[PDB]
Amino acid sequence: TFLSCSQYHKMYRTVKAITGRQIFQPLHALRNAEKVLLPGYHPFEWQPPLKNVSSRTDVGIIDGLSGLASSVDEYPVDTIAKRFRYDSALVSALMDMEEDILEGMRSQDLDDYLNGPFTVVVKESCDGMGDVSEKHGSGPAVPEKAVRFSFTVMRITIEHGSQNVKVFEEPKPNSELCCKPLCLMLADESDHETLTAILSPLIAEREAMKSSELTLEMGGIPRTFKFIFRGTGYDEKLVREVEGLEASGSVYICTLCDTTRLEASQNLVFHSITRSHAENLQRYEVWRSNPYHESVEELRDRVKGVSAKPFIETVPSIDALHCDIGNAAEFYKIFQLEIGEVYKHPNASKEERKRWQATLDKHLRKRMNLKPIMRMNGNFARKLMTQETVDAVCELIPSEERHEALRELMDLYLKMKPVWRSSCPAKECPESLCQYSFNSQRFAELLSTKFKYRYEGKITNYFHKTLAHVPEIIERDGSIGAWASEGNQSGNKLFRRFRKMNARQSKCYEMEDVLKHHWLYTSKYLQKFMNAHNA
Amino acid sequence: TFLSCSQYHKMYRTVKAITGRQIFQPLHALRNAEKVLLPGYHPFEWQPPLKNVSSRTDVGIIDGLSGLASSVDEYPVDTIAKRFRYDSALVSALMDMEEDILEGMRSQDLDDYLNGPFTVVVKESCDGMGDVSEKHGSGPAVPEKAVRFSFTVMRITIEHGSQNVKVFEEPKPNSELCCKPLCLMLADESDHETLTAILSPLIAEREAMKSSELTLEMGGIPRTFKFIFRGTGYDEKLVREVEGLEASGSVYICTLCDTTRLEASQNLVFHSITRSHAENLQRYEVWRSNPYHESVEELRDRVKGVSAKPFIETVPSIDALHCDIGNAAEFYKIFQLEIGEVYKHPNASKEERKRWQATLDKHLRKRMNLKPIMRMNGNFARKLMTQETVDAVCELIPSEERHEALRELMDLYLKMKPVWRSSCPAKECPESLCQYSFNSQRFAELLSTKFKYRYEGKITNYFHKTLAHVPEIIERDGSIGAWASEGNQSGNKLFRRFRKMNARQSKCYEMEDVLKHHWLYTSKYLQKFMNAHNA
DNA sequence: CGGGTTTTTGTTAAGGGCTGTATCACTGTTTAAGACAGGCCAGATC
DNA sequence: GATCTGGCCTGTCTTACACAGTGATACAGCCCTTAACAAAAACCCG
DNA sequence: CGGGTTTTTGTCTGGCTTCACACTTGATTTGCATCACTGTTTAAGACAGGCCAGATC
DNA sequence: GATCTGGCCTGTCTTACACAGTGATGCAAATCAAGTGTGAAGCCAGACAAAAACCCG
Ligand SMILES: [Ca+2]
Ligand SMILES: [Ca+2]
Ligand SMILES: [Ca+2]
Ligand SMILES: [Ca+2]
Ligand SMILES: [Zn+2]
Ligand SMILES: [Zn+2]
């Protein structure tokens, strides 16, 4: 309810004095019940012990700088940052859902008194937010950016009998209140030095606990958990940055296969994922070393635009959210270009196209009340992307064979969108999946011919991904929509709301508070209560 | 507690599902319990009727523009503004404090069923809070201002037999939560045409209900109320604006006596109070008409600086908040001067000035943790005006006697501060009240002799009001602290909060929501629920 | 008026468990509008 | 050409222009109990 | 070890009890959806020509 | 002289950067409000007779 302590105390004492009873509990009984829900409360132990990681079990909110050298002699740093220790936070996230683990265990007809090697599958994701500053006073202070690194327990399995059974699977994976916060920093997500300064310890802890087993007493008996991390909720820019690629405008487009934007137009769907992390460390080594004594423009070809040391280990994936938003903006542009009738007379001016845009947006907020937006958002993408939109915009272009072509294009795009928009297209839409190959090869066909005034050279990133990589990503990892960044893209509102209503402005405590409240919010032993009206 | 409706409903359904009972009430129950506490619910009857005011009794929140013609052909107005009708507001206030004034008659050994002509004494306060905007997106561009005209039932008094007994007196007169809001608008306080367009109807209503008697059934038996309005919650700026006086930096300084700054410095404390509202209207008539055919520079002597038509009827009084802030800032200036020994070597340059300022700032921050600031608030003025602060700053002057010449000065200013700052100096500090004349006269001598290097010509306005008019404003009104703008100055907080936490962004509903919620917050039938824990 | 009784009450101090409220460290990071007085140029004028 | 006078420009001044609200910590009451000893009306009993 | 002493149960037929509960039908409350409205661009970075300007044969 | 080439200038094109939350309406479902006599689930009757948990020769 985003109440504060003074307001909760007002309500407490008022209900108490009126009713006579004590319906709400006092504040200290909330601090005590809170100590149980943060990390740093339960006893756990690793085996073998974690290399370079402490052994204590009461480690709460650590300073994020990790003892970063802060004097007037080292590289200047003022980015305040708080975090959890990865292992203790993961333990807390598991004993926050002990009850659901046990319930799923019973549901799968398993002996509730079991302690097998529970294989957890976590999905971690960082996403830098912008302009988290405010106006606490008479002044427009400054642009202030933040970065949240967060994770989520995606799926818990056990190796019972001779197989694996889902003891637990996240209901809505990319939701604002199942993405647990792990690190909060106030820094530009492209300030590579400070970013690595903050995130290096977390990657260290992650690499450490990737190779051991966690003993944790869970409701009586102790259980042994094994972890498998999957960094997937990184948007395209953060993938190209952390993994050590060149910026998005390069010749090398796909962060999953090493193909060049040009040759990605002569051949649209015959690629295969070949951009791992080990290979990219190897390619950076070849770059920095240059053992074949090549020129810059030959060494680039040798190492496929890798000119930086891969920092975090991500996995090849496509970010369904930004994939769909980019496709929608792309279609907005193609609608404008169809209005301009460019397929017959090219090379208009830098204002004829603006007039075409005016035509389009007037017609749209006259035939749909679809208000124009200068920043493409998923809402405008859902509203735009319909067969009704070509149904409308057909009456703005003179020829009708363009109606036919664009109608067919929209048909194929909507016929394939669910396969990467769902959260389990193996069962939710298996016909679309088993026909994706054909329904996208013909989409590429019709992009080759009836739009070659655009797709002769440059074909954008997300179209290449959407067309050529989706089926094998599915055959590799189940779905595409679940493994996305929508979860970490919602919590910006929570960040701002907590920093406004529940904080202490001290610039040192003021971040512990946000981190703590967002942790509590995304808890589950509490959502069990706030969802009590569903019996 | 400032809950939304979604949040309140969430808490409601949670408690209902957990407990199983129903402690909180559904939203519709609260809307029904709200329709009773807003104005435009009870029946009332003016006798004789109110000239130019309707007779309906169910008029609540209405467009503040009062049907101001808004076409392309009229003077363009764009200010959103909501208001209550003044009589409806007073009726709701009275049948809100019904229980309290019944208890008052009980305590005063009167009859519950007594229907004497209750004379009410209401305070009027209008304050133009500024910068009430927030950044919705990107761009700090537009600052927007606001104005809230409000009132406060200050005392209620029945004329039992042949004596007036105080059935009710406000405990905290200038408090956050008894200043009932009446009208509020988004417009500069000095956009004089808009301000008059909005406040002309309200003035019409408060002029209508000055020769009538509200008949209102209160706890069964009907009662006859009869009003006295006093406009006092006005900062110097609006006083001068809506009385038809020259801007505050003129030669005619006091809004109570018509005297020149030079003559104020020659004669420090012997003035009377000789500037009413009818006198202002009559002097404006002299101005506009110019009956004696004389040039501007002696006509302005004839009309003592009245060159505009008076708009509202305010009373001759001094604010207290701005009074002590101004006097404290003037002592701060005297300190910056004494550090530099301006008396020995006058006419320095505009670098030693800032040097003196930074000297005093660093010194005070070192000695008292009194971190300096630019906008001098009330906490700064509170801390700075202490005998300890002069005892500290006294260690920065090479002189031997300026020590005592500041010690005595601060001594007398402190002997004077309670006299006006008190909400009833008669029975809180009558010794200060009977010595105030002597203390102010000695203070005046001290400024005139050991500080003539500053107060030879210019003497600021507040060192005229404070010095020469307090011992008569007291004898005319009682206190000075009660009749002040603090109650309104505080409510500004609430506005901003409401405007972001309880509103509809509709730019038409988004203001009546703020106004309704502020009326509720200011109610009393609810404050004696949120104060149940004490009693 | 008493006067044995009830019938209930007043009191002590240590230590703890609990609860309610006050206190604490801390965060804003220059005004804008108008009045008047010089002072110096700048042009009107003898 | 010399001189008298007004206009413009800065420059000082005087009124305003958003700090109470956040979580955490610290006291200050305040009741429960040991065990006994004494104390206001409540009231028949004499 | 299997046999024996606790807690704990079945157990009496009677009369008792509170209270759910039959069976309408409209006047209320309560739940859960809708609804109209709000924000009013880019900012770094890659690649490509193209023009010009200075170098070189 | 004549041309080549390299540097700077825009000029497009790529990924990215803030919309669910406000108070209001408005129908569907629930309940509930009486009627009046029912039976049903326990209550408890002091005292008596077949089982689980553990002592005991
Ligand atoms: Ca991002
Ligand atoms: Ca994001
Ligand atoms: Ca003001
Ligand atoms: Ca104010
Ligand atoms: Zn690819
Ligand atoms: Zn005066």
User: What are the DSSP calls for A505-521, one per residue?
Assistant: -SSSHHHHHHHHHHHHH
Find which nucleotide's C1' atom is closest to A455's CA.
F13
- On whether any CB of chain A is under 8 Å from the CB of B375, the answer is yes
Tell me which residue of A166, A169, A129, A138 sits closest to A152, measured CA to CA. A169
Q: How far apart are CA A207 and CA A231, in angstroms?
A: 12
Resolution in Å equals 3.3
CA distance B179 to chain A (A): 22
Q: How far apart are CA B43 and CA B48, in angstroms?
A: 16
Amino acid in the structure at residue A53 = V
- For the beta carbon of residue B77, count every other beta carbon within 10 angstroms: 16
B140: exposed, middle or buried (C-beta count within 10 Å: 0-12, 13-18, 19+)?
Answer: exposed
Q: Do B18 and A529 touch (CB under 8 A)?
A: yes
Residue with tokens 């204002």: A351
The token pair at B493 is 């907080």
The residue among A177, A533, A534 with the most chain B CBs within 10 A of its CB, best to mutate, is A533
Q: How far apart are CA A303 and CA A257, in angstroms?
A: 12
Q: Do A135 and B138 touch (CB under 8 A)?
A: no
Nucleotides of F under 7 A from a protein CB: 11-25
3-state secondary structure of B530: helix
First to last CA, chain A: 22
CA distance B292 to chain A (A): 50
Phi, psi of A309 (to 5 degrees): -80, 120
A121: exposed, middle or buried (C-beta count within 10 Å: 0-12, 13-18, 19+)?
Answer: middle
Q: How far apart are CA A150 and CA A174, in angstroms?
A: 12
The token pair at B477 is 């009104």
Whether residue A48 has a cis bond before it, omega within 30° of 0: yes
The token pair at B360 is 């005093």
Three-class SS string for B65-123?
CCCCCCCCCCCCCCCCEEEECHHHHHHHHHCCCHHHHHHHHHHCCCCCCCCCEEEEEEE
Amino acid in the structure at residue B42 = H
Q: Do A13 and B529 touch (CB under 8 A)?
A: no
Q: Which residue of B has its CA nearest to A138?
A: B131
The token pair at A69 is 């050298």
Q: What residues of chain B lie within 8 A of the CB of A496, using their CB?
A: none
Ligand nearest to the CA of A241: 1
Q: How far apart are CA A40 and CA A61, in angstroms?
A: 9
Rounded to the nearest angstrom, the distance between the alpha carbon of A155 and the centre of ligand 3 is: 60
CA distances (Å), A507 to each of A122, A131, A510, in order? 31, 17, 5
Q: Which residue of B has its CA nearest to A143?
A: B138
Q: Which residue of A has its CA nearest to B131?
A: A138
| Cα angle B70, B74, B80; round to 5 | 35
Are B13 and A530 in contact by the 8 Å Cβ rule? The answer is no
Chain B contacts in chain A segment 201-230 (CB below 8 A): none
The alpha carbon of residue B346 and the mean position of all alpha carbons in its chain are separated, in whole angstroms, by 39
Give me the total of CB pairs closer than 8 Å, taking one residue from chain A and one from chain B: 47
Q: How far apart are CA B469 and CA A227, in angstroms?
A: 80
The alpha carbon of residue A433 and the mean position of all alpha carbons in its chain are separated, in whole angstroms, by 23
Helices (H), B83-226: 86-94, 98-107, 192-208
Q: Which residues contact B226 (CB under 8 A, 6 or more apart)?
A: B117, B118, B119, B120, B213, B214
Q: What does the DSSP 8-state code read for residue B132?
A: -
Ligand nearest to the CA of B490: 4
Q: What residues of chain A lie within 8 A of the CB of B533, using their CB?
A: 13-14, 16-17
- For the beta carbon of residue B240, count every other beta carbon within 10 angstroms: 21
Q: What residues of chain A lie within 8 A of the CB of B10, using their CB?
A: 1, 530
Q: Which residue of B has its CA nearest to A20?
A: B533
**Whole-number distance in Å between A221 CA and F54 C1':** 28
Q: How far apart are CA B168 and CA B483, in angstroms?
A: 16
Rounded to the nearest angstrom, the distance between the alpha carbon of B505 and the centre of ligand 3 is: 26
Are A229 and A210 in contact by the 8 Å Cβ rule? The answer is yes
Q: What residues of chain B lie within 8 A of the CB of A532, using their CB?
A: 14, 17-18
Nucleotides of C under 7 A from a protein CB: 19-21, 25-30, 33-37
Chain A contacts in chain B segment 114-133 (CB below 8 A): 131
The residue among B497, B530, B531 with the most chain A CBs within 10 A of its CB, best to mutate, is B530
Tell me which residue of A95, A203, A97, A125 sits closest to A484, measured CA to CA. A125
The token pair at A450 is 């009836």
Q: Do A2 and B2 touch (CB under 8 A)?
A: no
Are B130 and B108 in contact by the 8 Å Cβ rule? The answer is no
Rounded to the nearest angstrom, the distance between the alpha carbon of B339 and the centre of ligand 1 is: 56
Name the method of structure determination.
cryo-EM
Phi, psi of B404 (to 5 degrees): -70, -30
Beta-bridge mates of residue B152: B123
CA distance A233 to chain B (A): 26
Are A363 and A393 in contact by the 8 Å Cβ rule? The answer is yes
